[PDB]
Amino acid sequence: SMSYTWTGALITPCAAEESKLPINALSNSLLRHHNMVYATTSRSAGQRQKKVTFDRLQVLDDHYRDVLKEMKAKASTVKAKLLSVEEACKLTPPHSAKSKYGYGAKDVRNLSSRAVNHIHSVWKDLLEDTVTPIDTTIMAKNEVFCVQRKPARLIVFPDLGVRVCEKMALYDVVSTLPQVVMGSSYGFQYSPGQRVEFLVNTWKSKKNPMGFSYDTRCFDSTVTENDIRVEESIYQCCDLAPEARQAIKSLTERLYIGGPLTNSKGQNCGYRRCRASGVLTTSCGNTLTCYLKASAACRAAKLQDCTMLVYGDDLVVICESAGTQEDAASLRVFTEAMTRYSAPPGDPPQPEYDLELITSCSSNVSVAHDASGKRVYYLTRDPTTPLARAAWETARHTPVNSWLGNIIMYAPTLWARMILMTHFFSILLAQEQLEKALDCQIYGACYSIEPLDLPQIIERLHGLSAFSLHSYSPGEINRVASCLRKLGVPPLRVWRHRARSVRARLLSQGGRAATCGKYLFNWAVKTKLKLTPVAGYSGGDIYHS
């Protein structure tokens, strides 16, 4: 079956689209090589359509059915509840896309009669009708990158009223089921500090550890009708209210398995027979499906004492080594099994015998040292995309502030501390907006966060050591330095000089501002001060504050 069929109608924008990096008076202080930064637009949608459109073949063996039975047994222990209309409304992001039927996200959150009445009618229709395909909108995403250009990603989502009903039927399920079914392998349960701890402990638990990442090419398109029905069967193992069972069946048949694609202008663009990127079950569904296929593939490859870590379509396996030649051979069998299950890799997997050489979710483990000189592990990444997006956000206000999300999730890194913290606190100081809450995304979920609360947030997610890490590895430092030269960002020595100023400015204001100065920028001073004291919903339209 083809992942998509297309009519020929274009994927259209709903507003003006900027591809070129916007520039203001602050831009050059961060980044000089402006032509290297670009944003994707609907003009490349055609290119993406070609990439994501292909035939899927699936051959399912006993390993697959064995693992599925085990997952269902665990799912059978979960008890999930329906959320009320009111609870589902409160989880709706303030700036979520408005309904076609005369109400928006703020109406939903406020429990307006019009919004609530339509939600009730959508819900009743889900109970009464388990066959009629539900409409979806297809859009090209606008995302910023550094050159070497990517074509726009496509997103597919149903109407607001449907999105609220998804929460009612499935929010409790997708929040609780994955951890029970997959145990320690469910990647979204960890904070960055907890994840690093798990990865290190998993590596040390093996006598002779080997590990590899496996990244499937266009995962959403490899997801078949079978996969989505198997996914439903796992959900239905839960102890559920009868009304929830019906709604989950209806949503699966009418939305999750596939449906018609409509552009922003209301024209039929085609039909989908694979994963929709913008439904509540996207993250949970991808995690379960990846875990199922990969667990079965481990058995086919006879990999010994496997510990898997899965988040959406991202996969890492750490296991007992059988020797270099033997490990390489076993990965070939693993990939052959995954391919039979419909999930071939973008690049063939490579066995690694050092934890730090494995990259997943664009990230790798690295080592620094705390004040006492003890080794502290932390997750980092190539800073190119974070810095490209920071430059865009310096000149343009955007729906999501990636810089804030990056500071929070990569707070221990030398690039987040020296560049992102220094740059944006200077900007916030100049506009007196330190107390202004900003929208950002952590693990696909939307959060409203004031910059002044960053010290407490960082401490809780990474520990107090995030404010005193030093003696970073030569490889990490070189990667950062190389990226700065590439983008025309000033060298780290300049940022240290700037941070002393920003620190001094923050201390001068007292209160929570001074606390930001003290903890976030203690790295910048020569004589240091004494420093003292969730889940995954990518595309799921989820909000917390």
Ligand X SMILES: CNC(=O)c1c(-c2ccc(F)cc2)oc2cc(N(CC[C@H]3OB(O)c4ccccc43)S(C)(=O)=O)c(C3CC3)cc12
Distance CA 357, CA 350 (A): 10
Instruction: Render 93-157 in DSSP notation, one character per residue.
Output: -TTSPPPTTS--HHHHHTT-HHHHHHHHHHHHHHHH-SSSPPPEEEEE---EEE---PPPPEEEE
**Would you tell me how many other CB atoms lie within 10 Å of the CB of residue 484?**
22
Q: Could you give the C-alpha distances from 416 to 109, 411, 445, in angstroms and in order?
A: 34, 6, 21
How does DSSP assign 277-333, residue by residue?
Answer: TTSTTHHHHHHHHHHHHHHHHHHHTT-EEEEEEEETTEEEEEEE---HHHHHHHHHH
**274 DSSP 8-state letter:** S
DSSP tag of 22: P
Name the strand (E) or helix (H) holding 270: strand 268-272
- The sign of the CA dihedral 426, 430, 436, 438 is negative
Looking up tokens 């193992």 gives 237
CB–CB of 274/258 below 8 Å? yes
Structure tokens at 441: 């995304």
Backbone angles phi and psi of 365, in degrees to 5: -80, 140
| Other CB atoms within 10 A of residue 480 CB | 24
Q: Tokens in use for 429?
A: 């100081």
- Give the integer Cα–Cα distance in Å for 3 and 56: 7
Is residue 66 part of an annotated ligand binding site? no
Dist CA 488 CA 436 (whole Å): 30
Q: Where are the alpha helices (DSSP H) in 33-61?
A: 45-52
Phi first, then psi: what are they for 523, rounded to 5°?
Answer: -60, -25
Say if residue 382 carries a ligand binding annotation: no
Please tell me whether residue 236 adopts helix, strand or coil conformation.
coil
Answer whether 541's CB lies under 8 Å from 168's CB. no
User: Given the structure tokens 């989908």, which residue do they identify?
Assistant: 272
DSSP secondary structure letter of residue 259: E
CA angle 154, 223, 538 (to 5 degrees): 50
CB atoms inside a 10 Å sphere around CB 202: 20
Read off the tokens for 4: 């998509």
Please list the residues that pair with 441 across neighbouring strands.
446
Residues that bind ligand X (CB under 6 A): 187-188, 192, 195, 199, 211, 309-311, 314, 316, 358, 360-361, 363-365, 379, 405-406, 409, 441, 443
Binding-site entries for Mg(2+): 215, 313-314
